[PDB]
Structure 1
Amino acid sequence: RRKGPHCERPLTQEELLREAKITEELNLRSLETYERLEADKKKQVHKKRKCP
């Protein structure tokens, strides 16, 4: 009977959250396009030579 728990930060705003995720859509599309283009322009599946 000395200690006790705590909790805070009860905030979630419906419309502001919708806006926030509609914005995160930008980051998601940027990540997808960046990954796709980087893969296509760097991998170009192939091999290299040996190091003897």
Structure 2
Amino acid sequence: PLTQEELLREAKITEELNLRSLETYERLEADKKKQVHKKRKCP
């Protein structure tokens, strides 16, 4: 029973939330990949 404008506003809010989630997932994956490639020794 909702109208199009309400759907658009809810879409805006959910878009903000999903962008936050996507950014967090990208950061976690990039950090994990960067940490995997590390390899060092000791003097």
Could you state the TM-score of these two structures normalised by the residue count of structure 2?
0.56
Note the residue ranges of structure 1 that are not aligned, 5 or more in a row: 1-9
Using the size of structure 1 for normalisation, the TM-score is 0.49
The alignment yields a C-alpha RMSD, in angstroms, of 5.7
Which portions of structure 1, spanning 4 or more consecutive aligned residues, are displaced by more than 6 angstroms? Answer: 47-52
- Structure 2 gap segments, 5+ residues each: none
| Larger helix share, 1 or 2 | 2
- Structure showing greater Rg: 1
Identity of paired residues, percent? Answer: 100
